[PDB]
Design an enzyme around this catalytic site. Structure first.
Site, PDB file in Angstrom:
ATOM      1  N   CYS A   1     -24.865 -24.150  -3.937  1.00  0.00           N
ATOM      2  CA  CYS A   1     -25.198 -22.876  -4.739  1.00  0.00           C
ATOM      3  C   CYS A   1     -24.274 -22.168  -5.132  1.00  0.00           C
ATOM      4  O   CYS A   1     -23.203 -22.082  -4.541  1.00  0.00           O
ATOM      5  CB  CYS A   1     -26.296 -22.312  -3.959  1.00  0.00           C
ATOM      6  SG  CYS A   1     -26.344 -21.179  -2.901  1.00  0.00           S
TER       7      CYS A   1
ATOM      8  N   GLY B   1     -22.930 -18.719  -7.262  1.00  0.00           N
ATOM      9  CA  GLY B   1     -23.007 -17.138  -7.685  1.00  0.00           C
ATOM     10  C   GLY B   1     -22.428 -17.871  -9.389  1.00  0.00           C
ATOM     11  O   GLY B   1     -21.976 -17.639  -9.296  1.00  0.00           O
TER      12      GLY B   1
ATOM     13  N   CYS C   1     -18.868 -20.119  -5.320  1.00  0.00           N
ATOM     14  CA  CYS C   1     -19.619 -21.009  -3.979  1.00  0.00           C
ATOM     15  C   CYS C   1     -18.761 -22.167  -4.492  1.00  0.00           C
ATOM     16  O   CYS C   1     -18.580 -23.234  -3.690  1.00  0.00           O
ATOM     17  CB  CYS C   1     -20.157 -20.524  -4.210  1.00  0.00           C
ATOM     18  SG  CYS C   1     -21.044 -19.073  -4.523  1.00  0.00           S
TER      19      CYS C   1
ATOM     20  N   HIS D   1     -18.832 -19.789   5.501  1.00  0.00           N
ATOM     21  CA  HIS D   1     -18.965 -19.560   4.080  1.00  0.00           C
ATOM     22  C   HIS D   1     -17.384 -18.857   3.670  1.00  0.00           C
ATOM     23  O   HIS D   1     -17.820 -17.792   3.074  1.00  0.00           O
ATOM     24  CB  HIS D   1     -19.978 -19.313   3.963  1.00  0.00           C
ATOM     25  CG  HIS D   1     -21.087 -19.686   2.070  1.00  0.00           C
ATOM     26  ND1 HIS D   1     -20.009 -20.428   1.069  1.00  0.00           N
ATOM     27  CD2 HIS D   1     -20.803 -18.760   0.900  1.00  0.00           C
ATOM     28  CE1 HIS D   1     -19.905 -20.957  -0.275  1.00  0.00           C
ATOM     29  NE2 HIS D   1     -20.766 -19.600  -0.195  1.00  0.00           N
TER      30      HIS D   1
END
Lengths: 387, 387, 387, 387
Positions: free
Chosen positions: B374, B376, B88, B344
């Protein structure tokens, strides 16, 4: 800008396609090599600031295999990790790029290198999400599509080697001669124990894999000459004079020179310079030439200043062109064999050849060395080191 | 170390899953955004030294989609290009990492950002190469496996959001309130024309896509409250208070401050600092907190020095925790809406939110800004900018 | 040899490809039709001696869909059931073959007909068991491979229709004229209620499907003439003058004449004769001609003795050739429309057209009737009935 | 009703799963056996009126494999051909059903039997046509789904064998004793040359396959007793006491007794009677009992009138129950071994065991014989013959 050293290196044996590591994942290979590279640097995993690792055929492996390797090697969750893809160059540019970050002062110690398991790379179904609707549909080998073919010209990397054979007038016999020498050099080096130090065994729960599987002892010119062209009707490039499809990992610890001094680490080598450059996709195998010229210029060196070269043998055709146009010492390159004999686990190879370079430089008491690779899509990357 | 500026930015509209870009590839989206980012910098493609681009779900796309985007945008074959994957965070860390290379002096001008087409990501057949042998076999959605699930704990990213909801005591209603606000802010911003400048139209041969598809006008608390938990029985995280699955690209030109001066380029902003940090995979949504603390410390700033924040809304649960623990101004973050409303597109999002930040800072005449995401696997990445 | 009667018949509506029965299995359609055929015979399921049912595209449906239909319809476990495949003829030859068994005395009462769900037929991976090894692999639409193509000549059934168009000199306009008439006859029949009696509703848990979906009202010659050839460049066969791809079931109860008398059942018709015959695969659409000649000879009849014909409209090209060479009354065939309008659910169609024949014979007070179908692989099958 | 004889029989060797016929299609096996069965009847292919052939796992094989076998064997295009599926019984019921048609007078001479290639049966993707949409999807072994599992109870055929073991109190040791005897009988018969006459070699372009591959010489009780249960935790049914997965074809010529007389053909046997019957799917292995009772009653015989039995060994558990409840002579059944040793190529097996029966009856100078098989879905089928 501060200086950067290569503290340590470790690699797995290189497995054959469908061979030793048919069921041993890229992440598992990477963890094995990473743990040992860390130990060979006389540091603990918590001392790594971040990890930057190459890997190309990562479909179905889960999120970010660099993070998987880092955590599996015991590096704390607080330390970042990122995967990079510059195809065949990934395992070497991870090293140079990490050196850029360390030179700038934003890291002191990094885990670098690459991991690749071509055997375990999956097939793909592009129509699966929304449907094929009617009639037969595509069912795609990700290794070929994402790893071993040029996307711009829609043909195999082997055709780019044919393009160089034609344009540089590199004959079938000349290609086979290089392949023969690669095999015999690798045979001899392996038998003399020259890969013993660099390799870390892989333990399969037990089976121990500690030997490069792909080497073909008793290769001969007669055998090579009988092979059929692999990529083009009436071509010159064969399975015998092309790199293999292979599985492996190779990991290194890089750190600021001042940090190695503080810790009392004797490094394998100091990084002198690097370069990455492009060429037309059609002649990708030529990439090492501009990349290496760039690196040499940055170092204020010429090829005459270099004692030992590792130039990845993607295809004999391209390898001959690179050696000739860089004026490399023909028996001072790939002195323990190259990828025709040892294999080409794409995202690992740049780190694999650097590992072999560093251990051979040390045993010869050489002073300077150079690793370079051609890169699908039309690039090259190079690293110059000294000890 | 020299200073680095962001010369320009352009993004496509963000498409819905199976929507506007169901058949418009990540590379095509990237090329559209890259060409326009280059024009918005008053440079030509030959002036780019190298490209560094994020992309996560790259199976079946061919070798190295960064190289594909670069060449498609007209950048010469001589200029290198590399794809990065920090999940991300990829589209934002491409920007910070490029800034590291430029600060060091090894590049003057780079193309950065990210591209992602989740709709077009394929299914995988791990057993296809060597066979399933007997009995049913795995047939894997690469989007879920490689993009939207945690590999260490083998569960969806949404479960990491549940973990934060439980540990930080973030209620369903609190999550839905954030989601509601995201939708209404996005609705209002879109209607007022506030995305008009940043978006570059995508032309499908003709259909023109120039509006963010995923925004849901007339979202209400009543509607949100009726939704079922998406990831866990008796959970709190729903489709309505989670980010979307989406397609898009966003591209920027970064360059040395001295180079922008030479060329007479008025930059969008100057890069102040950056940071990337890790947390436990189980609470990945918290990553922005240590990443942002690191970036602020490097800048000699506190959150009180920041005028505008883009903090990617992966899940309302994590977004509430981040805002609360960083003491962010609750209505000075995602002021034109966030990923719950806008989407996203994993490897694009970091560049998408930075693009939105920069254009809003300029229109407000703000001085300082911060983008954070943030990641993953348990990370965060942050970029601080000033104008 | 004793005489055999058709006690009853019931069919589902015929669904469009991806339409009404996209998710309603061949077995579920068959059970619906079978239960109602049994009730329309004034018998209970325990009175069925055995079941013989057509079905072609049965991959992934589990063992023996005839047994599934029988048990689902409440027929006791003691009664045998078998699936047959003579491609397009399956639903009609089940009827004639059952009549052979009953004539011989080995059954008194049988459930016959056929069921087909083309929408739900799967894709196949021939290399999946032992592996694809390297390079792209086959990913096969079972509907095309096993249902809609000729295996001997490796081309679509539509090419066999082109072969007949060429050899019999059947023009594009002649094909379109037949298609037009089929559509208008079906439109008119449906609107007048003429399918109401024969159809049994399918209830989807609720949605009720009770109308033939595929009929195209307001078809015109202008529209048909604009269509592109579907199978061959510069061909004559189009989607508009070819049968559809469709889903449906049709079931009948057959029994000895003496058994119907015993039970006080008024049959739909008595079976007079039957015939199945072959032709070259290349001209499969001609199969009805020798099959029908054989059946007529067995009956001591000529075509002049037949009051009503159902001849399945696989392709207008073949249908014109059959009508012309059998000297059929051009407006006494498919009087309520044919498969161009109504659809061609392969293994059901023979039972579907027989059902339509029997109900139309009764309403007209006709005395004699004939159902015939062409069959992929080069066959025809025919049934002659009287009332 | 006229009498019917079995003029001739020929079978391929039975191949192991992934063995001799890994790449030799069901159609190719069938053609080899059919050509030789025709020659063994002293007729030419043009003398066949029609073909009726069993085959179960026919996905991806193209239209109607019976037609493919017929045409490949040289039978004219004018002669019809149809494939039947009553699962495990298909290869035997083709024989009895053909006899029904011939008894009635509608055929004089037919090609019957069955063909099956389990190795080459494909995997299926049910979601491929319209898409999986999101998340992992089914990827189905057609052999298991359509051949080796019960659809009503959704479990393997081996669980139906466990059901019989439990209800009839058939111990693990009793099952292993039957398996042991099967192996030793097959070993001995093969070594003595007793399969030499019935087998027709398959020539692979050369490799000649002429021996049953699956037989395990030197099987012992010690070895069998060590095997783990194959289907159920703490079960009794193992790979060693269950039938194999196998490939093969077996073909016969049947004809009216008066036609054999006319032609001067000495038949293998005359058909006396037949029967097909049902039981609950859960206990399918018991099917031979009611089927055989029906056949014996039709013949006015008892089991005491039968000199030799072939009862297919789907699972030792079911085979013991059948032998005990029919009061069969324990060493007058499967006298040259059964499917535990020789294999179970589903749609071929009924014709395979009949072929073995007929050749053994002739060599023993037996007068009467019986072939019977259990059938997935809860059936049995039987044929009684005399010479």
């Amino acid at each position: 800008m501060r200086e950067v050293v290569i503290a340590s290196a470790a690699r797995t044996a290189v497995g054959s396609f469908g061979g030793a590591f048919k069921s041993v994942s890229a992440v598992e290979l990477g963890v094995t090599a990473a743990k040992e590279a860390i130990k060979r640097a006389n540091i603990t995993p918590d001392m790594i600031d971040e990890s930057l690792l190459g890997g190309v055929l990562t479909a179905g492996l889960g999120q970010n295999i660099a993070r998987q390797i880092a955590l599996g090697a015991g590096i704390p969750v607080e330390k970042p990790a990122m995967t990079i893809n510059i195809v065949c160059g990934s395992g070497l540019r991870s090293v140079s790029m990490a050196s850029q970050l360390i030179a700038l002062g934003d890291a002191d110690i990094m885990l670098v290198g690459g991991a690749e398991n071509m055997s375990m790379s999956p097939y793909l179904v592009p129509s699966a999400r929304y449907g094929a609707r009617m009639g037969d549909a595509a069912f795609v080998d990700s290794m070929i599509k994402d790893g071993l073919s040029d996307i711009f010209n829609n043909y195999h990397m082997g055709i780019t080697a044919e393009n160089i054979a034609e344009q540089w007038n590199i004959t079938r016999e000349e290609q086979d001669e290089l392949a023969l020498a690669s095999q015999n050099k690798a045979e001899k080096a392996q038998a003399e124990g020259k890969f013993d130090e660099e390799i870390v065994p892989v333990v399969i729960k037990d089976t121990v894999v500690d030997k490069d599987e792909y080497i073909k002892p008793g290769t001969t010119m007669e055998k090579l000459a009988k092979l059929r062209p692999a990529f083009k009707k009436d071509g010159t490039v064969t399975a015998g004079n092309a790199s293999g499809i292979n599985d492996g990992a190779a990991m290194l610890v890089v750190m600021a020179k001042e940090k190695a001094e503080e810790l009392g680490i004797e490094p394998l080598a100091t990084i002198v310079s690097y370069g990455t450059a492009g060429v037309d996709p059609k002649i990708m195998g030529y990439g090492p030439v501009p990349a290496t010229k760039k690196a040499l210029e940055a170092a204020n060196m010429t090829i005459e200043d270099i004692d030992l070269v590792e130039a990845n043998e993607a295809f004999a055709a391209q390898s001959v062109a690179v050696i000739r146009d860089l004026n490399i010492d023909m028996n001072k390159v790939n002195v323990n064999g190259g990828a025709i004999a040892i294999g080409h686990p794409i995202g690992c190879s740049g780190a694999r050849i650097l590992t072999t370079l560093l251990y051979e430089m040390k045993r010869r008491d050489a002073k300077t060395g150079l690793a370079t690779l051609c890169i699908g899509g039309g690039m090259g990357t190079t690293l110059i080191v000294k000890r």
